[PDB]
Amino acid sequence: AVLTQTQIDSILADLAHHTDTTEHITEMGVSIYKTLFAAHPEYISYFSKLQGLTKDNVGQSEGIRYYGRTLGEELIRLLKAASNPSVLEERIVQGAKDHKARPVTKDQFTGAAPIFIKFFQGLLKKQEDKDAIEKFLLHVMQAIAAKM
Numbered sequence: 001a002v003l004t005q006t007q008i009d010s011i012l013a014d015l016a017h018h019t020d021t022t023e024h025i026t027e028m029g030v031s032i033y034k035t036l037f038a039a040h041p042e043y044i045s046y047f048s049k050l051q052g053l054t055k056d057n058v059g060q061s062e063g064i065r066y067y068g069r070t071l072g073e074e075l076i077r078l079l080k081a082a083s084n085p086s087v088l089e090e091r092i093v094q095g096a097k098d099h100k101a102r103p104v105t106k107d108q109f110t111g112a113a114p115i116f117i118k119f120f121q122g123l124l125k126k127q128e129d130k131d132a133i134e135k136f137l138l139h140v141m142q143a144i145a146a147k148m
């Protein structure tokens with residue numbers, strides 16, 4: 001549900017070089033999307049700025065960078081908020097607003113959790129942090145879906 005400050009600090013330390021600049025945070029998000037869209041090319045068309053793109057050219061698009069940055073920034077927001085119940089709930093509310101009335105469904109949203117989790121597990125060094133990010137993202141994405 002929840003992460004301790006120590007856990008957040010450990011996770012952020014590993015992510016520091018992926019998230020230090022706007023360009024890097026954007027590239028981190030694009031990398032998640034490359035994985036998501038390879039697994040679900042039908043999801044490319046869900047995004048207003050990716051209309052017309054396919055699995056063969058989405059990775060090179062300007063549009064994927066727009067979402068890569070929004071996604072990356074929000075993921076770091078969620079992580080930083082993980083030890084503060086009220087701020088985390090604010091982010092979960094924003095999550096629901098971000099995804100309500102969109103082509104993505106509740107089931108597709110929670111169903112994509114393993115893609116995000118496995119991506120982050122790859123970037124983290126300590127097994128305890130790999131375990132932690134899994135618990136956290138599953139919790140967050142279920143909470144967002146429930147409000148949709």
Ligand code: HEM
Nearest residue numbers: 043046047048049070071074075098102103104109112141
């Ligand atoms: C915890 C994981 C996720 C986070 C933090 C997140 C974050 C965001 C953010 C910040 C936006 C707003 C972007 C904007 O300003 O337009 C957004 C929009 C959107 N997201 Fe996510 N997202 C997540 C997972 C997913 C998944 C799994 C999907 C499945 C396809 C998805 C699909 C969408 C769609 C369709 C929009 C609307 C895009 C548009 O046309 O403007 N998201 N998301």
